[PDB]
């Protein structure tokens, strides 16, 4: 155990050992953007792949061409924090050497005429942060990965969508990456068809004739021949015995002297066996057998040259007579059946109205571009550019793989375009599906759906911008001359920036990141969406794709999804899931070999795991060898059954393999019903971080993994000792073995303090290490918002009781004690930003100033001399933070004085109060002000003071980090010189400037001293360079929006306590609203006088079946009992030996638990620190589907001297009497969700109204009224409340001359209205009149 893990060891109850640890949780986004942005020699990904897909490009003449050489990315102009402050995107400039060579077409090949190349700036691409996010326009975004269908060919049939016959219609679909589609399909008349881009149908031989295949070659490709042999007016036929399958023999087959079948006798397999053991080949057939067949060969006459019979036509008596007199004594008809070799292609050729390649191309043109006269070159060019052109069609190397795998081919590579053999194989395979061999494809398989991620989507949008810029530069180099043109002036840098900024700003998958807690960030980054560009559509999707497929096991979580209309469409990645090189999801598995479950870990896709047989995770082992039973439970082909121990092929790598992260943080998940487990996994992301975070007593073990992998903590990069801990800076002196020989060995960890998140919560990092403590590589130094000692901590441990309390927990409601409120347990900080921007009106500019017309001195009591509020001012609702007055002339006038400005005169003076006020009911201090003035004007005194504060702060920060690095470098200098020579006192009495020039002759330590002296020189050089860069960066102005003079950004900080109305929740879907905050003398209490903190209703348990709530309550009671015993020993100050014995006795309690915490290897101060962290309860890891049982829970409760049934006697706090039945009391982890009644409470009497409708606005932000909808109108109509309904429709709404009358009538004490016509009805009359329709009211 490490020296930071000995501080608080979570007692794991897990039984199965962790063979493979949980991987990096954010590997998907970071790996996708790294593949997009890195440089690759031949395996082209991203920018190099697009820059080779679009370059080089010549003219129409070939006089010149532009070549791509190499690309690089410059340093971003602003950092992450500076982009988040200034409100700009975090991007790096793209520079690429574009080589322009000039040919000489006047010469035969004048290749070298003029060669130009320079680093052309082609837009900026937004960089990804170290946590997986994109800072776009000052807001942090997350690009959600997409689940779309893979490119390739998919065979599927409708399930009888024509009940006139009940037939099923098999069909194919060749989906490319980019390019048109292709849909071969059947009809109820068994005639194949073709839909290109889902347009009107054409017969499916039009494509074959367009592929230069005549009717002869079509019939050879799609049929085999029953060859006939007519000699001297008796017909014989060359018979292979594998052609007579289950039909009544209308004719009798013969031999040389043998008779086999009789009249009216169906052919049997026994007779087929008879024929293949007698082995006759040539059988005389009667005349009537050929009458009914279809000839597969056109038969020209050799004498007259007249075509006596073509191919694909029905024969007859006169036709066979014509063949016999013409002399073709070997006629060839195709083999057909009625159950296994259908006459499909013959009927399609009969219904086909074209007979030539050119007429087929004309028909394809008339289907594609209707209402246009076709020609030869346009029809041929359109059909070639449909599928057989590299720049208008692409399967993109994953469609080729799925194409060859669906057609059972071998080579997984090839071209991206379609071909003759490809289309022929698709039609052949669809015919095979129709005949019976093979089955349709499962469209909800995860071998058919792939993961398209942020790097692939950014490569696609970069390619769109690239082909736009390519077209523009191609017409430029085709039109202009060649002597004065450069690549810099001929490449436009607008459309690539437009494409990538349109994507990264307002795509459907570029989402405003949820950062309530670290769990919300990690779940938003690990999200998979079925919607998006080229995916599904939300209202147009049904239960077929919103289901849990059996291939989702280990790849997609079944119990983390929203419960609204996005339920089967937004998904979450499983814990161990990865992607292929193609983008298909795969999950690890342990390989068994002769029963021995090895550590061979194989990542199998969904198509490979159906072939094998994979054992369950909950099957026991011995010595990591065989299975202890002989019939283990497995799953093959999607179904589950029992299998033998030598039959098994694979085994699951863990027990948390199926669930996602948030569904793995639920303890006792296997006792919760999946509905409430889904709701609890969703509600875990809505938890607000509190004032002091608290580790859960009943956890899982994924807490540390989430808290480190979320990137919200501050982990150590290298191991060493800690040199200085502030509340904003941790300095670590690195150990020598982890130190590079050229650096100073000093790590600086600046912490973020009170930064507003996306959901207006608090983000601040607090140091968890102390002064002088050692840390290792990967150690948590600073906690996050809702972390605690590197463990995820979303709520607080509340002593809970399950009983009804006077109806105060009636229907999911929660009764809360007063200690919860006094102890600030659910007190959350909500930082909130309000901006006041002084615009540029055309009547003059709006002035930010100290003087405000028509306010008292109770408004300017907190302002400064410049009009801005002071940093630290305890403002309340309605106070003025920054005063802004409009110029001479108002902007919108109130009707109380609008008539007084009309009849007396608008003064063209007396400016309007337009100040930034705190919203109503919102207290809080002011923690930061930021003024962004436009570049060019003199700013202000307060803005100048803020700028001097930033200047001296940046100088102090850079000089302090320079002094710290100088102290580290000088300590390394004195260490290496003490190791070299014996110079101790002569360097202490010498000043530190004379530490780099003295020494002795040249050795390894002298070279180290010289290179560290050069390190110090370049350190102070980069120090003064960065100081001057920061100085010019903070003195230069901010290029704001056009029309903006200056913006003042005020930052409030509200501290929110719980109150009745706040939604609280546990991890099992046990949500509800606080109904009352009870006094602690009124709360129920036990025999020791400890009152409970929260009273929950037990009626919410049985119909919802979330028993993990009750088991978490019991295990939390046992954990707090153990912590109470440790606290009693620490308050009695007993020993260290009895404490070591009791903590070891509590750690060794499980039945067959994996971890062995031995305290004999511990020191005494380590055991004392462990007990000081254990005195508030022993944290317990309960893995999902690997948890503690009732026997372990009851043994722990018997250790803690607690009742083993988990139910104690409670007394009423009011009457003093005892409750009759024993009540379940324990400790449950309760979260404060982000649905706060301060944010939901909103009332309005009269405010502002919409422009067109003259109805009130909508929202708490703009002070709007509640909608009285159609359903509420129906409710009032069903009551009969006609006057109430009429006053909802007119005087509380769009009756402009009636609502002012109603307001003055109410002020005059007269509760009577005078309603009139709704202005929205006048709007509707005007719109129907504008539609050319005379509607009018009729005066009787």
């Amino acid at each position: 155990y490490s020296y930071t893990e000995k501080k608080r060891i979570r007692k794991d109850f897990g039984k199965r050992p962790q063979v493979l640890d949980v991987p990096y949780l954010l590997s998907i986004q970071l790996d996708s953007f790294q593949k997009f942005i890195e440089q690759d020699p031949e395996g082209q990904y991203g920018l190099e792949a697009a820059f080779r897909s679009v370059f080089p490009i010549q003219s129409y003449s070939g006089n010149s061409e532009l070549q791509y050489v190499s690309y690089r990315l410059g340093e971003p102009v602003f950092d992450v924090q500076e982009c988040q402050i200034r409100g700009v995107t975090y991007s790096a400039p793209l520079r690429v050497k574009l080589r322009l060579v000039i040919y000489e077409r006047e010469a035969p090949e004048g290749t070298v005429k003029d060669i130009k190349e320079q680093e052309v700036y082609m837009g900026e691409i937004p960089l990804m942060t170290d946590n997986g996010t994109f800072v776009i326009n000052g807001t942090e975004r997350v690009i959600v990965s997409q689940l779309h269908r893979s490119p390739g060919v998919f065979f599927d049939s409708d399930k009888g969508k024509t009940h006139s016959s009940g037939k099923v219609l098999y069909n194919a679909r060749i989906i490319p990456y980019r390019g048109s589609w292709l849909d071969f399909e059947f009809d109820p008349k068994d005639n194949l068809f073709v839909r290109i881009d889902r347009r009107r149908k054409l017969p499916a031989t039009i494509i074959l004739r367009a592929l230069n295949y005549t009717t002869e070659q079509i019939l050879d490709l799609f049929f085999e021949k029953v060859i006939f042999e007519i000699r001297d007016n008796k017909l014989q036929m060359e018979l292979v015995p594998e052609r007579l399958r289950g039909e009544t023999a209308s004719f009798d087959i013969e031999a040389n002297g043998k008779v086999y079948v009789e009249k009216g006798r169906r052919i049997t397999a026994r007779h087929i066996r008879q024929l293949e053991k007698d082995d006759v080949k040539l059988i005389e057939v009667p005349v009537e057998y050929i009458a009914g067949k279809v000839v597969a060969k056109d038969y020209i006459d050799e004498s007259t040259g007249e075509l006596i019979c073509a191919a694909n036509m029905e024969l007859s008596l006169d036709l066979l007579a014509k063949l016999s007199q013409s002399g073709h004594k070997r006629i060839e008809t195709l083999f057909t059946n009625d159950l296994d070799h259908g006459p499909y292609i013959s009927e399609t050729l009969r219904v086909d109205p074209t007979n030539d390649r050119l007429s087929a191309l004309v028909e394809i043109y008339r289907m594609m571009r209707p209402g246009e006269p076709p020609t030869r070159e346009a029809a041929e060019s359109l059909f070639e550019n449909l599928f057989f052109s590299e720049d208008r069609y692409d399967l993109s190397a994953v469609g080729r793989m799925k194409f060859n795998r669906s057609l059972l081919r071998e080579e997984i590579e090839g071209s991206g375009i379609l071909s003759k053999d490809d289309i022929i194989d698709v039609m052949k395979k669809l015919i095979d599906i129709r005949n019976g061999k093979g089955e349709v494809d499962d469209i909800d398989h995860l071998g058919n759906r792939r993961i398209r991620s942020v790097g692939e989507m950014a490569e696609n949008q970069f390619r769109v911008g690239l082909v736009r810029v390519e077209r523009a530069v191609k017409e430029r180099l085709s039109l202009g001359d060649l002597d004065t043109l450069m690549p810099q002036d001929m490449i436009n840098a607008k459309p690539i920036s437009a494409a990538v900024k349109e994507f990264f700003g307002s795509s459907q998958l570029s989402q405003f990141m949820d950062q309530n807690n670290p769990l919300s960030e990690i779940t938003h980054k690990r999200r998979i969406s079925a919607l998006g560009p080229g995916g599904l559509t939300r209202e147009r999707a049904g239960f077929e794709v919103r289901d849990v497929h059996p291939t989702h096991y280990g790849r997609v979580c079944p119990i983390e999804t929203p419960e609204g209309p996005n339920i089967g469409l937004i998904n979450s990645l499983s814990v161990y899931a990865q992607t292929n090189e193609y983008g298909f999801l795969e999950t690890p598995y342990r390989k068994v070999t002769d029963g021995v479950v090895t550590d061979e870990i194989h990542y199998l896709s969904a198509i490979e795991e159906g072939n094998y047989v994979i054992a369950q995770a909950n099957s026991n082992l011995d010595e990591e060898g065989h299975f202890v039973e002989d019939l283990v439970t497995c799953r093959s082909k999607g179904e589950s059954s029992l299998f033998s121990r030598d039959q098994v092929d694979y085994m699951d790598v863990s027990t948390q393999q199926v669930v996602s992260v948030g569904a793995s943080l639920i303890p006792f998940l296997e006792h919760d019903d999946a509905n409430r487990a889904l709701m609890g996994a969703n509600m875990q992301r809505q938890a607000v971080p509190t004032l002091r975070a608290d580790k859960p007593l009943v956890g899982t073990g994924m807490e540390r993994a989430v808290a480190v992998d979320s990137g919200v903590t501050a982990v150590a990069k290298r191991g060493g000792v800690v040199q200085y801990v502030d509340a904003s800076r941790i300095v670590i002196k690195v150990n020598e073995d982890e130190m590079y020989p050229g650096e100073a060995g000093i790590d600086i960890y600046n912490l973020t303090k009170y930064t507003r998140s996306n959901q207006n919560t608090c983000i601040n990092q607090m140091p968890c290490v102390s002064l002088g403590e050692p840390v290792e590589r990967g150690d948590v130094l600073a906690d996050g918002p809702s972390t605690d000692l590197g463990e995820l901590a979303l709520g607080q441990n509340m002593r809970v009781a399950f009983m009804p309390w006077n109806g105060y927990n009636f229907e999911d409601s929660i009764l809360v004690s007063e200690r919860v409120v006094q102890e600030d347990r659910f007190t959350t900080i909500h930082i909130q930003e309000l901006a006041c921007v002084s615009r540029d009106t055309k009547l003059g500019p709006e002035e930010i100033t100290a003087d405000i017309p028509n306010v008292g001195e109770a408004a300017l009591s907190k302002l400064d001399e410049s009009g801005i509020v002071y940093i630290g001012a305890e403002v309340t609702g309605g106070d003025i933070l920054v005063g802004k007055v409009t110029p001479k002339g108002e902007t919108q006038l109130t009707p109380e004085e609008k008539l007084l400005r009309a009849i007396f005169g608008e003064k063209a003076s007396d400016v309007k109060d337009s100040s930034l006020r705190v919203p109503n009911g919102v207290s809080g201090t002011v923690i930061d002000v930021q003024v962004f003035t436009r570049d060019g004007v003199e700013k202000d005194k307060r803005a100048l003071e803020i700028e001097e504060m930033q200047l001296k702060q940046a100088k102090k920060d850079l000089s302090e980090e320079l002094q710290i690095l100088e102290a580290g470098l000088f300590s390394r200098i004195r260490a290496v010189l003490v190791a070299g020579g014996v110079e101790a006192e002569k360097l202490d009495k010498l000043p530190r400037d004379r530490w780099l020039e003295l020494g002795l002759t040249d050795e390894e330590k002298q070279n180290q001293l010289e290179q560290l002296a050069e390190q110090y020189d370049e350190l102070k050089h980069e120090f003064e360079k960065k100081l001057e860069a920061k100085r010019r960066k903070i003195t230069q102005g901010d290029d704001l929006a056009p029309g903006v003079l200056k913006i003042v950004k005020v930052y409030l900080a509200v501290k929110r306590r719980i109150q009745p109305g706040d939604k609280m929740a546990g991890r099992h879907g046990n949500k509800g609203v606080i109904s009352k905050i009870n006094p602690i003398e009124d709360m129920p209490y036990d025999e020791n006088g400890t009152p409970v903190d929260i009273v929950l209703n037990p009626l919410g348990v049985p119909s919802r079946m979330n028993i993990g709530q009750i088991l978490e309550t019991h295990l939390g009671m046992a954990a707090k009992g153990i912590g109470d015993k440790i606290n009693a020993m620490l308050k009695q100050q007993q020993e260290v030996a009895k404490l070591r014995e009791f903590i070891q006795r509590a750690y060794d309690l499980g039945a067959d638990v994996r971890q062995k915490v031995d305290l004999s290897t511990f020191s005494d101060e380590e055991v004392m620190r462990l007990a000081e962290n254990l005195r508030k309860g022993m944290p317990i890891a309960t893995p999902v589907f690997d948890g503690a049982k009732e026997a372990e829970i009851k043994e722990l409760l018997k250790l803690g001297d607690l009742p083993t049934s988990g139910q104690i006697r409670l007394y009423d706090g009011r009457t003093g009497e005892q409750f009759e039945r024993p009540v379940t009391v324990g400790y449950m982890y309760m979260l404060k969700l982000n649905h706060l009644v301060d944010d939901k409470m909103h009332a309005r009497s009269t405010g502002s109204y919409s422009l067109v409708t003259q109805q009130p606005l909508g929202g708490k932000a703009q002070f709007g009224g509640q909608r009285f909808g159609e359903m509420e109108v129906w409710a009032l109509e069903a009551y009969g409340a006609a006057y109430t309904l009429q006053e909802m429709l007119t005087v509380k709404s769009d009756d402009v001359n009636g609502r002012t009358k109603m307001y003055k009538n109410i002020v005059d004490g007269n509760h009577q209205m005078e309603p009139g016509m709704p202005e929205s009805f006048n709007v509707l009359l005007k719109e129907i009149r504008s539609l050319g329709i005379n509607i009018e009211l009729e005066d009787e």
């Binding site: 008339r366 571009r369 209707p370 209402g371 246009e372 006269p373």
Partner: peptide
């Protein structure tokens, strides 16, 4: 061929195709 079209630029390009280019 006239008939099954509604795109007016397509109708313009169809009806302008009657005339021939000049030498």
């Amino acid at each position: 061929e006239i008939g099954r079209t509604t795109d007016p630029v397509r109708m313009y390009m169809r009806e302008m195709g009657t005339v021939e280019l000049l030498t």
